Design a protein around this ligand. Structure first.
Ligand SMILES: [Cl-]
Ligand SMILES: [Cl-]
Ligand SMILES: [Cl-]
Ligand SMILES: [Cl-]
Ligand SMILES: [Cs+]
Ligand SMILES: [Cs+]
Ligand SMILES: [Cs+]
Ligand SMILES: [Cs+]
Ligand SMILES: [Cs+]
Ligand SMILES: [Cs+]
Ligand SMILES: [Cs+]
Ligand SMILES: [Cs+]
Ligand SMILES: [Cs+]
Ligand SMILES: [Cs+]
Ligand SMILES: [Cs+]
Ligand SMILES: [Cs+]
Ligand SMILES: [Cs+]
Ligand SMILES: [Cs+]
Ligand SMILES: [Cs+]
Lengths: 396, 395, 396, 395
């Protein structure tokens, strides 16, 4: 990756993460994305939105969003109609794959300024009626939940990803109690970061105009929901009796978007821009679809090798918490101590808007590195279907 | 471009293009895409499917297709579970942008063998019920047609693409008659190519489990030309004064197409025979309702990226979203129809939107061989205001 | 007794052809079929005008999406005065015959002199239901309910299809798959023979469908579909392997309507009308919902008692063939030979538009009594939920 | 003909749309009301009931024969004859007329009649799934609008027939607003003074996931009156010039009501104490969109059939489909409002359409009891152009 032209992150921003049918459920996925894009660009001293040439934006459940979600995000943010816009779907990894593709587009010389990230409005995912065109002459018929179908169910086995999380708990020996105490810890980290103002810089608050008083949404909705007694007492969510995965120790369904602004070396110098970070390398990997939970154990070493960095040099990791067991298993397989992982909490406590989470964890990682005075960060995120994506950054 | 690693096409393949609710409507988009991927890889002497490292696959109307359509295409084609898979949506340009991204992934050194292309099953696009979660307390509600919503409607104007086609006819001065004579010509070219066997090589026929088994070997739309009915039919989007009709627009269709890309190093390592070299590409965009003439920007950009002059191109594929789209881009660019869509275009062949960008590249490679040409350029506009274009050299 | 009450005369009856499910009459709504039968019945009374009709009782079971008061739509569509009293009646399969009883009673209490009664059903245009759109369903696949299954064919109590209760009936009274199959063939042959001789020509009012010339539906659509080896070889419909009830030996889903004109003795002479028949009595009965199949074995003796007529005096019976086993069980239970039952065929061969069939079999009964030179007739029809209705007529 | 006696009546509280009773189906509300009426008649066993007529308008998704489900849910014998009746808003009263007729012709001695409606649980319809719809957005029909509230020939909501009623007889936005306010405080006066407690059978809703048990004892609507908010709200069906609003119209509601009827012989045989005697009834109909005025025909017809003059009635219940309906019919019959809906009407109490015909009779007997009257008349208009009226004598 060294022999490849440099790619700088000059800013990042994210919406608050809203709960399912909660604080941001009135906004569409492109409205969330536009908000994150516009906020990220407003931070770059010396760069105009009209300088952005190309947009890659993740989005998984695109049904009823309309033509090209990424284009709607770009135009809604005030970018020029000349902007090249592509929507990316690598399930839960879409937001990070989008940033990788944006970096590659600078590296091959086809752009000098790129916005990448992702968005998801799980609240506004529709239901589907699949057989109306040819008809169904007789019988009860099904209305398909688009979240379940296109977001949460492995296509091969037709099983929800929570069931494959159980397979992870069984394979790697994590109990209900280990997953619950992880969840409590990541909720406590998210609450502590919230209360300390450590998300204030990365979050762009959302103003909802009154139809009625206006409402400003400022903080992530989920972290405050921790109730330790209830979390430890709730029934398993996917396997009765012997199940270890619960709604409290899994990621919720959520709404949100996140964006980063990328520039080439030449553009950085031309406009005298202050870089936040440098992309050092990345890696995608995949294995058996039902073992998607531990695909980050392949992608992270691959990204570190691409970046020319040893695992021990990393100051902070973001390992996306699709489930508590996913963070536990990948820490075990890679030998990464928890005190280097999700230092401000993870998706179990913060929320998991699936198309945006890969970019959300990168935004949060940059805030962790600044707050903890770190230099090298690595973000890794698994995705339904067996994949994972990982990226290494250097704070400047 | 030239100072970056070279990218070679070592094969390509496509399904027949089926009509809406027609010959392929029993297959899902991943089944079509897997078929095209498997068929393209079977053509490469000395390359195994297990050598494919990464897949980029276009798909626009992904509702109810399930998690990551590209990953389903890849696994359905027999690729390894280690394969990196990403689904791409740039509406009508998705299949060509997928190939571009695949080329870039080789150029940055992250893959040496990449499958790219696209798939669409418009037949199996569902309807949406959008307000079941929060409810709707009182009043008639709508079931949204997913084709209209996510494929064919400009988001800003909330107008179907046929009305943007009328803007194109008004802006660049093409009458109903000019559009109709263009459409008849492209149907004639597609039928001539069909009968002469010129699609035999690129098409991988589909066997349908049987009643006995059905084999689908031909594109469904070309035979439907009736020049008398075409000249007499009422306009489809503007009553009375309209110029765009269903016969002179692309249909709704099902199909998939795939290409196999390899690096120079890997070509040498496996002693592979390349079909073509990617010379360059370009994306461009402008006002969304003017997407119809975005190729007049993307094509010059691709040629410049390729270091190739427009006059040196031996054949162009200009995707026929509507007849007026080809007419307007030929006018703006100064490209004679004698070099355009030499085996017919999407008005006659069909337009499965997530696949069409790779579909036209597969057809172009056949045109360059059949017409003894060397340099080809494919350009395709897309809803939202964009276009993508690519330049290849037949080897 | 009945003699202390005014007499009620049938001066007319008519019926549409019975169409197959999504078949010949599928483009017509229930009120259009109903209007057709009412207008045809009234056109047959010399000395009576449509404006003389004062009140209408009309059966209809699956009224969803038919609009306000189906009976009122049938009346206004038939050309009846807007002063006409209109009530829609739902007693499931017996609705069409209960409407006739309620019409007779309205004369007998002296509130009307000219009454049209009958029933209609377009099972082809029964919609599907979305039951929880108002409050919402936050997450999960949902159901589109088939209105035929829900409001027509499923016993509300056990949530069982009536076919499975026909299977329960076969197990109760000992009727084999062969015995039900050979009855179905016999009633199919009777319906075809009656069709062949033109014995349905008087009672059926052909339907003209616009579109330049006009298509005309003259025959019932189901009788021609008999295929005796297909019928004996088909797999059972409700219990794989061991079931005796099949689709060929059950009634189909159908569209049709039927109406009769009732007058008081005063108006019969005041207008000098020629009566076709006299209503001598009726009987409603009900038992266990899953045993509705043998409810006519209670309603039929009750209607004979009400009329003061003996079962041996009856020249012809119409026992509605919801399933072939219904006719077999009721014949066995009542000691009625088949040689006096459904002489022109029954619903297994003719069709079962559920809201109309109670009136349809009375229309056919009057035709059987004319053709076979009989005087006393009895019509009995079971309905889902446990009930049955029966009526005794004397041909004049 | 044999006399028909009312031996008891009962009604559920009237729940608001998607409100306090929304968790109950129409047969559950109906079962509740039948059971409560039957528990009031000592000397009469629930197994003595031979026949049920029950009104219900929007029967979609209620299941087979709603009245049969009401009857069995109340504990009546499986031997009971059960028939569901739909004369739209008049179904509850027409059911009672049919029940009285069944006694008068000597086919039954104990009949339960009334009506039920759960407008909260009325579904939406998808009408073209069987034959299908190949391309285009489609409609989900609101079953309340289609089968309850829209006139068949005009395809206009009842609120627009109500505006017709205003212009036809000259009642302003103010006049209807003052009536609505008057019937609201007439209804609120009855709650606090307890004049509904006899007729209402409260409903128990037990929560047992740890949740607290809930009892519904009051009608939900009367407490909602805000006269400041009411006078200043915008019109509901005609902007600017309209006179009909949500506050001055009836709401959408859930509820049920039932009466027990006995023959002359059975009253003496079992030594039952009668609440009232049914004196007569009348049905009438005119132009569909002029249904608001049909009570002006049914009421005189019921009075004439009972052999009683209009001046002798101690209390009228004229169903307030809209405040303008009560105002109009009082104008044409010449009835003073001091003898109309003395405990309030449907604008303030609620209007579950299949039940109101029986609900207003139940309230009528409570008015005659509390006002020490002898002759009461209830009339009710229904969509389609009809109306029904009944005359009773308290005993
Ligand atoms: Cl994957
Ligand atoms: Cl675009
Ligand atoms: Cl019943
Ligand atoms: Cl009416
Ligand atoms: Cs800026
Ligand atoms: Cs901020
Ligand atoms: Cs959680
Ligand atoms: Cs370190
Ligand atoms: Cs091969
Ligand atoms: Cs080779
Ligand atoms: Cs081939
Ligand atoms: Cs065409
Ligand atoms: Cs050339
Ligand atoms: Cs006549
Ligand atoms: Cs006839
Ligand atoms: Cs049959
Ligand atoms: Cs009692
Ligand atoms: Cs009470
Ligand atoms: Cs109100």
């Amino acid at each position: 990756m060294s022999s490849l032209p440099a790619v700088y992150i000059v800013s990042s921003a994210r919406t608050p993460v809203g709960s399912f049918l909660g604080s941001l459920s009135s906004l569409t996925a492109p409205q969330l994305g536009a908000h994150a894009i516009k906020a990220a660009l407003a931070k770059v001293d010396g760069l105009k939105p009209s300088d952005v040439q190309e947009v890659f934006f993740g989005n998984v459940i695109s049904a009823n969003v309309g033509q090209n979600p990424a284009r709607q995000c770009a135009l809604g943010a005030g970018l020029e109609e000349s902007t090249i816009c592509t929507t990316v779907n690598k399930v839960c990894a879409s937001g990070l794959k989008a940033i990788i593709l944006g970096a590659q587009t600078i590296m091959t010389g086809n752009a000098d300024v790129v916005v990448a990230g992702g968005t998801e409005s799980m609240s506004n995912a529709p239901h589907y009626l699949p057989n109306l065109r040819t008809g169904a002459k007789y019988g009860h018929q099904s209305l398909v939940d688009g979240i379940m179908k296109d977001g949460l169910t492995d296509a091969g086995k037709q099983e929800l990803m929570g069931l494959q999380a159980e397979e992870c708990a069984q394979d790697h020996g994590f109990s209900r109690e280990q997953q619950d105490e992880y969840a409590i810890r990541t909720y406590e980290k998210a609450q502590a970061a919230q209360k300390a103002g450590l998300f204030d810089e990365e979050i762009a608050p959302i103003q909802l105009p009154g139809f009625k008083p206006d409402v400003t949404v400022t903080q992530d909705e989920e972290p405050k929901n921790l109730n330790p007694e209830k979390l430890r007492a709730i029934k398993p969510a996917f396997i009765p009796g012997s199940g270890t995965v619960t709604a409290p120790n899994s990621s919720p369904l959520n709404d949100g978007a996140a964006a980063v602004v990328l520039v080439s070396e030449a553009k950085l110098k031309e406009l005298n821009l202050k870089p936040v970070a440098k992309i050092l390398g990345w890696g995608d990997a995949a294995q058996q679809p039902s073992k998607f939970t531990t695909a980050p154990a392949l992608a992270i070493p691959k990204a570190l090798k691409h970046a020319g960095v040893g695992q021990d040099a990393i100051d902070a990791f973001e390992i996306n918490e699709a489930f508590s067991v996913v963070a536990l298993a990948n820490m075990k397989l890679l030998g990464i101590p928890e005190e280097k992982v999700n230092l401000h909490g993870g998706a179990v406590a913060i929320g998991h808007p699936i198309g945006a989470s890969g970019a959300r964890i990168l935004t949060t990682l940059l805030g962790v590195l600044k707050a903890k005075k770190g230099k090298l960060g690595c973000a890794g995120i698994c995705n339904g279907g067996g994949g994972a994506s990982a990226l290494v950054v250097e704070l400047l």
